[PDB]
Design a binder for this molecule. Sequence first.
Ligand SMILES: [Ca+2]
Ligand SMILES: [Ca+2]
Ligand SMILES: [Ca+2]
Ligand SMILES: [Ca+2]
Ligand SMILES: [Ca+2]
Ligand SMILES: [Ca+2]
Lengths: 286, 93, 321, 321, 93
Amino acid sequence: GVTVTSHREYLTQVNNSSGFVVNGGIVGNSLQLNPSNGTLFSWLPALASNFDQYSFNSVVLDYVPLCGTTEVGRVALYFDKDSQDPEPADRVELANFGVLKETAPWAEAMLRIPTDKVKRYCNDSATVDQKLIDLGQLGIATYGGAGADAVGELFLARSVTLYFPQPTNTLLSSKRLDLTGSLADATGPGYLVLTRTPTVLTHTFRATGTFNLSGGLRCLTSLTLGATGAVVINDILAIDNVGTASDYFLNCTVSSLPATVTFTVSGVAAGILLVGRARANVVNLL
Amino acid sequence: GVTVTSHREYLTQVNNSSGFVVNGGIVGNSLQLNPSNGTLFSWLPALASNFDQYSFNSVVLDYVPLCGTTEVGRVALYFDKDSQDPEPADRVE
Amino acid sequence: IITHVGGVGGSIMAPVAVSRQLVGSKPKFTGRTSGGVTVTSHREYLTQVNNSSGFVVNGGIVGNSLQLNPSNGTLFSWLPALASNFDQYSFNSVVLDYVPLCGTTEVGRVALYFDKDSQDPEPADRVELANFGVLKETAPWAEAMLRIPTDKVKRYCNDSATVDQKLIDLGQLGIATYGGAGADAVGELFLARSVTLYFPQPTNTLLSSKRLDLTGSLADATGPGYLVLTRTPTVLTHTFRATGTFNLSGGLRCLTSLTLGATGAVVINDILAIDNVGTASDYFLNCTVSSLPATVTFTVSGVAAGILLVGRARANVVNLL
Amino acid sequence: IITHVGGVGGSIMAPVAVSRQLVGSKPKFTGRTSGGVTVTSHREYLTQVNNSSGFVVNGGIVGNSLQLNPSNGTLFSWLPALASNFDQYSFNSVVLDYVPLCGTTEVGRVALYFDKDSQDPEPADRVELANFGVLKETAPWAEAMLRIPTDKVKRYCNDSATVDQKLIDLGQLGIATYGGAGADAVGELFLARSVTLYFPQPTNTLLSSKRLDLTGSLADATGPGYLVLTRTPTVLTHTFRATGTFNLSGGLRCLTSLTLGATGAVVINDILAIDNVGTASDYFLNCTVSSLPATVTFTVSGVAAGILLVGRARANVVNLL
Amino acid sequence: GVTVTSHREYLTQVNNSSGFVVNGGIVGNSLQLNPSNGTLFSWLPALASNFDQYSFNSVVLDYVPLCGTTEVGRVALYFDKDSQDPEPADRVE
Ligand SMILES: [Ca+2]
Ligand SMILES: [Ca+2]
Ligand SMILES: [Ca+2]
Ligand SMILES: [Ca+2]
Ligand SMILES: [Ca+2]
Ligand SMILES: [Ca+2]
């Protein structure tokens, strides 16, 4: 009952900098090559969630280019064997990696990844030494631009061996904010973080695609639906009761970072939601 | 670029009815083997959802026991090649 | 001989009752003359499966105990103190055995499984239990088996402590019952053993250390783990996972004389109970569990620091004169 | 090769120094497939013979410790926890080994012997040591041996307790030094092992229980014995026989705040110290000995009941938060 | 694209203590073999600093002599497979 997958999943759209940016000019070894990475693998997500040991055979970074032979910059894909080491500081550091590639933005690029066949574990129970379980880290780095616009969209060449199966993990996300607090439970994966600020929520995307959002919260105060970045709102429904708490269902569709959304409200005294990837699917009354 | 799968998925709890009943006495060929059948297959739910053709190699029905040697009845598993023909009316069909 | 009636060759008999007969499992050590290091194969018993109309797993007990590492003092009652002069463990055979005390007329489900992640959490429901790779599904009255997928990786025991219980443990073990009619006993399960002992060391102590934060949750551990010691704002919790005669030593922060309660299988042995009211206090006690649920709890107020130690002990004193 | 001078074939060389080189003793178990019961032969070290101008025996330590039974947690540092899943012991070979750290110019006597009565008392003087059947008499600097007379009688371990320590123990072991010039170190002695394990049992706990009478002397024991806990009318005595990291649990009858002293090789770890003044008290503490003399004592007044328990433990907590 | 290394690095000066001592009576498994251990390995310091996995093939402890045939003591080298177990309490461990 040991399954083998070899597929090609999309991954992110690289914007420029003048300055020196990595995986978003964001931080905390985001990309870790383990499948799941709900953050990295948008497709492999809920297949290996019925399994416990993972092992690759091929993984290749692909870099195509939307921009034109006259942008002015650097893209760069690398590979750290320590799922945990921290990120690229500068020019001289990126370049010293074993498995790196150095391309203009307009020109077309490749990278293949060094796969062992070690019996490595997926993240269902948790494990602080993310290194002894993760295959690698993945980098994408841009310096020397002229503007933080888009030049590149990178893909993921897959080949994975699934092993001992028992219980799909939770393709479904559960995310509690404490009443005044910080943070209640998790189930994840994790596509979203839901913070509050004393007034107002934060729904901060890590994932891309069509989602489905369900939930509401504690306020008292009618909902004004804002969000920021790559975002295609689909269905916003928005019960309130003013005085009390409220509910929101909504259906949106991200293809960027930064995607943000936020609900605007007052007296955010309990935050609850669930998120579990979904189609152009309804989410509103009639 | 294709997958193959061999696992074991639970299906429903057979209760009793002295009458004569068929899938819960629900009707509209529910049990169809296709995967998905979310009604039938609780696990493969999400593999054949990244795919467009399917083809089985083995399918076996497995029937274990909740009741005891003094329960008093008949159970019965069958297979119609027409995903669409209607259900069993009586004993003799 | 046997004449059984209403039977023509090829027919089925569901009898009034069935039973196997179990004997003295007297271990064999094998000398794998290696690094001059040892190998053990013996048969250790494991728990009495009681029923659960509802849906229960190793006793409704939670915090993957069960854990396949030897020691698991929680799991392995004999191997306790050999893999105790050693540092690397590796199995070759482990088989779950399920015999049955009950009779062909109880009405329920038992079920043995195996999770490769010593750490993933437990079975929620019907549809989840069944999806496991290495599972077995038996009525209760009828007789069952399970064999376990053993690698030969060089895995470490819990002598120093290690939060990623997964990268060190071989597997998780489940036993699950739904659909009963009463939470009585139907089954007693055994453990088919075979382990390869390696780099043998100065012998590790088996003593338990368990700190509650002042207002908090949890300070250190050393374990094994027989006990969890929680507080609630007033009052302690000493929640057993283990069975036998223990010895309890410690006291805590309160101010407020100790009232000694406990719950379930329990045979109190020696309760001694210093306090100082205003301040903190101490308790030594000696008790003896043979069940789950065994509970004990101390009753107190303003539980502002919890400390204890537990290290299995005889009918041994624990009180002044 | 070697040219040594002033030597004609047949002559004697008393060198500046001598030394043997000692290695990793990695045990072998043998499978005596019997009642499916085991056999062990490994090499356990035993103590560092220090000198005694005067006339001393296992440290000037008294209460035949030393005792050849396995466990003797006092004597055998590894066999501690195997003959611990078993109930009958029987040796085949036991040999005393005496190597030497010192040099051909120290000035003294060491001496290994063997009393068949686990219980007779100890060597008084010169003329007494020498009269033993199985004795050896070495300067200290020079290298020595002793082999021990083993019967094959079916002898019992100390799991239940037994006052006639003689009818159960194999022998007594002595090491004796007189005529020194200083109580420094010259020797480190080893233990050549070979034991036949028999009727293997549920594994016994190694936990120590030690009661002082109210005004009295002595209440119960369980032992092994690492500790003796005496009182003097004011004040306790906790007199070590054992070395390592322990864990101490208990308190006592006084009235009078605890002042924690101790003496010799000692690394205090956690001293916690409830009192109630007027009444009794409790102490948990965690310490770590590597010597004799290790002493500790609690200082207190009106020591009207003594109770404790001791059961070897790690760098483990033993205090509130 | 991998390296291999075979050199010899000095480690610390063993002094004496009639007591019973372990790495200087410093505590917290200092001597761990991993490279880096800057505390232990003074030279490889800066190769395994351009690398992420390591794997030894030989490791040998070498003990020469500063003192003289009338020094009066015991030295002793060992090896624990648990980078983490605590240190030796006494002679017998
Ligand atoms: Ca898992
Ligand atoms: Ca048909
Ligand atoms: Ca260890
Ligand atoms: Ca799992
Ligand atoms: Ca006995
Ligand atoms: Ca060790």
